[PDB]
Design a protein around this ligand. Structure first.
Ligand SMILES: *[C@@H]1O[C@H](CO)[C@@H](O)[C@H](O)[C@H]1NC(C)=O
Ligand SMILES: *[C@@H]1O[C@H](CO)[C@@H](O)[C@H](O)[C@H]1NC(C)=O
Ligand SMILES: *[C@@H]1O[C@H](CO)[C@@H](O)[C@H](O)[C@H]1NC(C)=O
Ligand SMILES: *[C@@H]1O[C@H](CO)[C@@H](O)[C@H](O)[C@H]1NC(C)=O
Ligand SMILES: *[C@@H]1O[C@H](CO)[C@@H](O)[C@H](O)[C@H]1NC(C)=O
Ligand SMILES: *[C@@H]1O[C@H](CO)[C@@H](O)[C@H](O)[C@H]1NC(C)=O
Ligand SMILES: *[C@@H]1O[C@H](CO)[C@@H](O)[C@H](O)[C@H]1NC(C)=O
Ligand SMILES: *[C@@H]1O[C@H](CO)[C@@H](O)[C@H](O)[C@H]1NC(C)=O
Ligand code: NA
Ligand code: NA
Ligand code: NA
Ligand code: NA
Ligand code: NA
Ligand code: NA
Lengths: 336, 27
């Protein structure tokens, strides 16, 4: 039996050397071309344990995306541990591309194909793949964007549902498009639009899955963030190199008992960093229309915990959960 | 994350603080 093991996976992508967009530039030096001859082999009569919450693939991806951002998006001023650094801070072209992670000789990536798979415990439909599927390294809070959908029903996953401190990762089975724009010609005012009925239906179906986990006698409530850094109180993300902070109150105020939801957003120059504890200042926004149309494919939630009612709030912050939301079906083993 | 200052901030909303990665979250 092949044992789980750590190695440096290599990355593969469709990056182009003639594209100045920063993910492309990073991948042109860090990665190889996307596998021209992918091969998935089913492992007959094999049952394998997985644990999405303890997976070194996540840690490697995290370090890679930190490196990508550090090389690519330079702040004008950075404050870490009382120390200030200043440097040139040019605007860049920024649009994530899919990255695949690949096993080098002596190692294999195992993939769980079980339909209901919660990320931990035994998998009965296991295959080997030369590389993962292509994952866009989207850095965001609250909502997971441009990811992969659950094939059948919505799936919710947690390291321990009974522990209210553990994040719940929701995987949708139907994308909800969200369009965010800072219009052409207040240069920091922006907004996001999404279908009201689609979002309401989404919340209803998530609530059903939550009741299935916590008790059908339970009443499910969504409420906004309880507070903290603006990055986690809002739905925050990077669009076109600019940092958007979108008020998500309307998304997360719901109970069981207009065509579009319009979320107000602000582009901020001073951000709390996700890569390390500290703050960074970037330059004011570029001119012109700044717009991103994204698929909402998942959510990060916390549950209040602590009678008869369960309250859930938008969460996130630790980007390792973003990577886990795509890497949950994979593990690396040593061939012996 | 700065946990102490995170804690120092959240209590003023009536709340405990904890890290969410490199971010401060109130509970
Ligand atoms: C196992 O997973 C594969 C991949 O999704 C699927 O095609 C197949 O039908 C599943 N069931 C098997 C192999 O019995
Ligand atoms: C958005 O979702 C649709 C299906 O809902 C899919 O066809 C499309 O490829 C997705 N876009 C991205 C960037 O993943
Ligand atoms: C998505 O999953 C929900 C249950 O979670 C189900 O009711 C719905 O029909 C599914 N939609 C699709 C397109 O599979
Ligand atoms: C994952 O599923 C297995 C089997 O269905 C179960 O034993 C385990 O408790 C689940 N993990 C959770 C709920 O974290
Ligand atoms: C899940 O969390 C609860 C609360 O912290 C704990 O009592 C329980 O033992 C945990 N379950 C595990 C670690 O399997
Ligand atoms: C998002 O933009 C697309 C075109 O890019 C449009 O077809 C769609 O209706 C928009 N969605 C919302 C909710 O405005
Ligand atoms: C977020 O939106 C809600 C609902 O309109 C509003 O009460 C709240 O003040 C907004 N937050 C900020 C920081 O403006
Ligand atoms: C989602 O994917 C589309 C298509 O590549 C892109 O235009 C959009 O900027 C992406 N969203 C984010 C937040 O990266
Ligand atoms: Na990115
Ligand atoms: Na995301
Ligand atoms: Na709020
Ligand atoms: Na992005
Ligand atoms: Na908000
Ligand atoms: Na760093």
């Amino acid at each position: 039996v092949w044992k789980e093991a750590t190695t440096t996976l290599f990355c593969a992508s469709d990056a182009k050397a003639y594209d100045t967009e920063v993910h492309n530039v990073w991948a042109t030096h860090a990665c190889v071309p996307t596998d021209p001859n992918p091969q998935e082999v089913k492992l007959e009569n094999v049952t394998e344990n997985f644990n999405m919450w303890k997976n070194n693939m996540v840690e490697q991806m995290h370090e890679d995306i930190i490196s990508l951002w550090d090389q690519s998006l330079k702040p004008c001023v950075k404050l870490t541990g009382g120390s200030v650094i200043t440097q040139a801070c040019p605007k860049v072209s920024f649009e994530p591309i899919p990255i695949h992670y690949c096993a080098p000789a002596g190692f294999a990536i195992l993939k769980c194909n079980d339909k209901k798979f919660n990320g931990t415990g035994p998998c009965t439909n296991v295959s080997t793949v030369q590389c993962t599927h292509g994952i866009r390294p989207v850095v965001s809070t609250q909502l997971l964007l441009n990811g992969s959908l659950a094939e059948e029903e919505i799936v919710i996953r947690s390291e321990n549902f009974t522990n209210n401190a553990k994040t719940i990762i929701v995987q949708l089975n139907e994308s909800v498009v969200i369009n965010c724009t800072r219009p052409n010609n207040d240069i920091r005012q922006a907004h996001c639009n999404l279908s009201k009925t689609q979002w309401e239906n989404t919340l209803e179906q998530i609530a059903i899955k939550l009741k299935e986990q916590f008790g059908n006698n339970k009443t499910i409530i969504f409420n906004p963030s309880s507070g903290g850094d603006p990055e986690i109180v809002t739905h925050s993300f990077n669009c076109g190199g600019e940092f958007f902070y979108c008020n998500s109150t309307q998304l997360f105020t719901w109970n069981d008992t207009g065509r579009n939801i319009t979320l107000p957003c602000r582009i901020k120059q001073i951000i709390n960093m996700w890569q390390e504890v500290g703050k960074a200042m970037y330059a004011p926004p570029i001119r012109g229309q700044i717009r991103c149309s994204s698929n909402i494919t998942g959510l990060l939630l916390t549950r209040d915990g602590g009678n008869g009612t369960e309250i859930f709030r938008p969460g996130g912050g630790d980007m390792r959960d973003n990577w886990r939301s795509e890497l949950y079906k994979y593990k690396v083993v040593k061939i012996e | 994350x700065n946990l102490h200052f995170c804690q120092l901030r959240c209590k003023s909303l009536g709340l405990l603080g904890r890290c969410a990665x490199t971010y401060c979250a109130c509970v």
